[PDB]
Structure 1
Amino acid sequence: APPKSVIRWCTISSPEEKKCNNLRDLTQQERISLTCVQKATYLDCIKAIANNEADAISLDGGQVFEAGLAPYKLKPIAAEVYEHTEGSTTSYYAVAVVKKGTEFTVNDLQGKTSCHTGLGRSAGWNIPIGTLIHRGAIEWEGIESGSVEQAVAKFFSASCVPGATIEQKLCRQCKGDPKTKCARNAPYSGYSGAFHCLKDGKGDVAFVKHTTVNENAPDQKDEYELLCLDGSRQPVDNYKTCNWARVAAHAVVARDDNKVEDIWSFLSKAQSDFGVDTKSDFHLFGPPGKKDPVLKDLLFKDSAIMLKRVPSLMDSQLYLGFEYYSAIQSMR
């Protein structure tokens, strides 16, 4: 086999860096070994990867979009795989979780408080906000008229939107220290952070994914329910008949160069050794379960069960698909 080499993973929080460096220690004698570099935000990681300071990061589809734009031009090389009733899938469902018995519908969201995974993320932002704009609930004639943040802050009374910087109302519901409560890696960030924002009474609704309630409250699951687009409420387990969209899996992105082979070699081996069937204490994926949300979705989502290599000919637009890609274009 070819000679040994190293890949540099870019992390977005100290818990992620710690997990990455645990994986480093466990892979140091492999042909492809690992180092870990932490940045303040995923965008710093995109920049670092485009500048050949790091090699890979897993991103939500909304950030896969950003990573593919000039001057970065990163492409997705591996997709997360989730459980499915048929076996497995490389997409997930965006849902709007509410507490059982609060009755209000999708048509009654004005003036509510809301919990989001992060600005510009699929389930947490692009899908719910784009949907509410399309329905005419959120009035927004396009970027030139004013920011999306401004329009959302006029609609919800207060929110937690990790990463929001234009509208202070979008940080009002966030938990944590002043300097970090509205950061993209804050306590209420991610699917699980947004769920805990709802659980804690800081939002009336959490814009999360189909596994989120089960990941965080498996024994209180049916104290929650879902807001359906048709105006109904349905059980958490009914997401296939009560979702806002199906969206492409989070993906590992990388430069369009030959380092992709080493990145995939490392990941292929790592998921064989540290995947759902591992003998180790270290799990590449999760595992899911009740615990503090800042421990969740580190490097990869806790709900991932494998990675599937993306064909080289797929870029970010093909990966996300033309329809969602164009939906994101219309919000910027």
Structure 2
Amino acid sequence: SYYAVAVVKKGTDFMIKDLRGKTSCHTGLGRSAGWNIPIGTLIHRGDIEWEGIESGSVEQAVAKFFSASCVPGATTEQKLCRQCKGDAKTKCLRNAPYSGYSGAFQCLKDGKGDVAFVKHTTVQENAPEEKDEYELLCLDGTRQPVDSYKTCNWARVAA
């Protein structure tokens, strides 16, 4: 099992209720911490307006919420590929540079997103000496340190 977390930089100040219009980094379309949990969570909060497949695709609803994102594997909305790093033609593929837990974290690090949807070991694995420059967005409207994932995660995931 792992925990799904939302990583942000200590320089910013927005909370979970303020995500509309920000830029986002995801591990890839359809993955647990990078898509299913965060998108699902926002739909239920009522922040992302989707009521059912008859109100469009999930992709279109997300592209209207974030100003732009990198979502490796996205199929219909080019806005979901706009922050992706790489060659014009392969940047948004499932195995592209900002794909995966590492690649999504690197997208936040390089300033291409305001938030990365990754898992609880991600920051320690990829930036152990810079852990203090990041924090997590909690469901209750606060921020907590990276090592506080147990009390600041969006869900526990089966894997």
TM-score category of the 2 structures, normalised to the smaller one: over 0.9
Q: Which residue of 2 aligns with 1:245?
A: 155
Q: Deviations over 1:41-98 (max 9, x none)?
A: xxxxxxxxxxxxxxxxxxxxxxxxxxxxxxxxxxxxxxxxxxxxxxxxxx00000000
SS of the aligned residue for 1:155 comes to: coil
Deviations 1:175-204 (A, max 9, x none): 011121000000000011000000000000
In 1, Cα distance between equivalents of 2:150 and 2:94: 28
Distance 2:141 2:99 in 1: 27
Distance 2:88 2:154 in 1: 32
CA distance in 2, matches of 1:109, 1:245: 18
How far apart in 2 are the matches of 1:242 and 1:111?
A: 22
Q: Mark the runs of 5 or more structure 1 residues left unpaired by the alignment.
A: 1-90, 250-332
**Which of 107, 110, 117 does residue 20 from structure 2 map onto?**
110
For 1:220, what is the secondary structure of its paired residue? helix
Aligned length in residues: 159
SS of residue paired to 2:4:
strand
What is the aligned-residue RMSD (CA, Å)?
A: 0.5
C-alpha separation in 1, matches of 2:76 and 2:54 = 15
Question: Residues 250-303 of structure 1: CA distance to partner in whole angstroms, max 9, x if unpaired?
Answer: xxxxxxxxxxxxxxxxxxxxxxxxxxxxxxxxxxxxxxxxxxxxxxxxxxxxxx
Distance 2:52 2:27 in 1: 23
| 1:16-44 C-alpha deviation (Å, 9 max, x unpaired) | xxxxxxxxxxxxxxxxxxxxxxxxxxxxx
TM-score normalised per structure 1: 0.48
C-alpha distance in 1 between matches for 2:137 and 2:153:
8
| CA displacement at 1:222 relative to structure 2 | 1.1
Distance 2:55 2:17 in 1: 24
Q: What is the CA distance between 1:170 and its match in structure 2? A: 0.1
Deviation at 1:145, TM superposition (A): 1.2
* Aligned 1:222-237 pairs, distance under 5 A: 222-237=132-147
Distance 1:116 1:217 in 2: 18
Residue 101 of structure 1 deviates from its aligned partner by 2.9
* Rounded Cα–Cα distance in structure 2 between residues aligned with 1:108 and 1:191: 23
Distance 1:113 1:105 in 2: 14
- Counterpart CA distance in 1 for 2:10 and 2:44 is 27
3-state DSSP class of the match of 1:225? strand
| SS of equivalent residue, structure 1 residue 101 | coil
Which whole-Å CA distance do the structure 2 matches of 1:93 and 1:237 have between them?
Answer: 12
Aligned-partner SS, 1:203 = coil
Question: What is the percentage of aligned positions where both structures have the same residue?
Answer: 91
CA distance in 2, matches of 1:221, 1:205: 15
Provide runs of 4+ in structure 1 moved above 4 Å. none
The CA distance in 1 between the partners of 2:89 and 2:42, in whole Å, is 30
Give, in angstroms, the shift of residue 212 of structure 1: 0.4
Larger Rg: 1
* Selected match of 2:108 from 169, 176, 198: 198
Q: CA deviation at 1:165?
A: 1.1
TM-score by length of 2: 0.99
**Structure 2 gap segments, 5+ residues each:** none
1:172 is aligned to 2:82: yes
Say whether 1:221 aligns with 2:131: yes
Q: Following TM superposition, by how much is the alpha carbon of 1:226 offset from its aligned partner in structure 2, in angstroms? A: 0.1
SS of match in other structure, 2:30: coil
